[PDB]
Swiss-Prot record, chain C:
Known outcome of mutating K20N: In strain: Beta/B.1.351, Omicron/BA.1, Omicron/BA.2, Omicron/BA.2.12.1, Omicron/BA.2.75, Omicron/BA.4, Omicron/BA.5, Omicron/BQ.1.1, Omicron/XBB.1.5, Omicron/EG.5.1; May enhance affinity to human ACE2 receptor
Chain intervals for the UniProt region annotation (Integrin-binding motif): 6-8
Role played: Attaches the virion to the cell membrane by interacting with host receptor, initiating the infection. The major receptor is host ACE2. When S2/S2' has been cleaved, binding to the receptor triggers direct fusion at the cell membrane. When S2/S2' has not been cleaved, binding to the receptor results in internalization of the virus by endocytosis using host TFRC and GRM2 and leading to fusion of the virion membrane with the host endosomal membrane. Alternatively, may use NRP1/NRP2 and integrin as entry receptors.
Organism: Severe acute respiratory syndrome coronavirus 2
Outcome of substituting N43K: In strain: Omicron/BA.1, Omicron/BA.2, Omicron/BA.2.12.1, Omicron/BA.2.75, Omicron/BA.4, Omicron/BA.5, Omicron/BQ.1.1, Omicron/XBB.1.5, Omicron/EG.5.1
Subunit organization: Binds to host ACE2. RBD also interacts with the N-linked glycan on 'Asn-90' of ACE2. Cleavage of S generates a polybasic C-terminal sequence on S1 that binds to host Neuropilin-1 (NRP1) and Neuropilin-2 (NRP2) receptors. Interacts with host integrin alpha-5/beta-1 (ITGA5:ITGB1) and with ACE2 in complex with integrin alpha-5/beta-1 (ITGA5:ITGB1). May interact via cytoplasmic c-terminus with M protein. May interact (via N-terminus) with host bilirubin and biliverdin, thereby preventing antibody binding to the SARS-CoV-2 spike NTD via an allosteric mechanism.
Phenotype when changing D8N: In strain: Omicron/BA.2, Omicron/BA.2.12.1, Omicron/BA.2.75, Omicron/BA.4, Omicron/BA.5, Omicron/BQ.1.1, Omicron/XBB.1.5, Omicron/EG.5.1; complete loss of interaction with host integrins
Protein name, as recorded: Spike protein S1
């Protein structure tokens, strides 16, 4: 744990990137989190929503 | 069947042409909810029930 | 835009509708602005024969 100050910065940046990548898996109230599924399932008036 | 004893039929292992359902004018209401009616020929399904 | 249709087909003169005269007779855009006007004309546009 001698080099914990640099490893803390590395871990924080990697964890922020991992959280940002993980947020793509959330649908945020939509029917799916995948854009291709919405674009292949729905007409543009409701796929827009 | 009556609505209290509504009949559930499994649909599996078939290729389905929904365009004869869209292009027929015999249906007074043809309303789809989680999917567009015209995209039904472009998708694959399981657990289809009538 | 004036035309004559059935009584159940007046729901298809709207943006974002799926239907028969919407696809092959008269289509409204999704960004349509304006007013649709409909009234019954069984006394004028109908004959007993």
């Amino acid at each position: 744990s001698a080099l914990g100050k640099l490893q803390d910065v590395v871990n924080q940046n990697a964890q922020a990137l991992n959280t940002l990548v993980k947020q793509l898996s959330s649908n945020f109230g939509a029917i799916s989190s995948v854009l291709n599924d919405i674009l292949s399932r729905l007409d543009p008036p409701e796929a827009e929503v | 069947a009556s609505v209290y004893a509504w009949n559930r039929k499994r649909i599996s292992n078939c290729v389905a042409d929904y365009s004869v359902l869209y292009n027929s004018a015999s249906f007074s209401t043809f309303k789809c909810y989680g999917v567009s009616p015209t995209k039904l020929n472009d998708l694959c399904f399981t657990n289809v029930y009538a | 835009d004036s035309f004559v249709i059935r009584g159940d087909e007046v729901r298809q003169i709207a943006p974002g509708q799926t239907g028969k005269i919407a696809d092959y007779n008269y289509k409204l855009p999704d960004d349509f602005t304006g007013c649709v006007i409909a009234w019954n004309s069984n006394n004028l546009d109908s004959k007993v024969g």
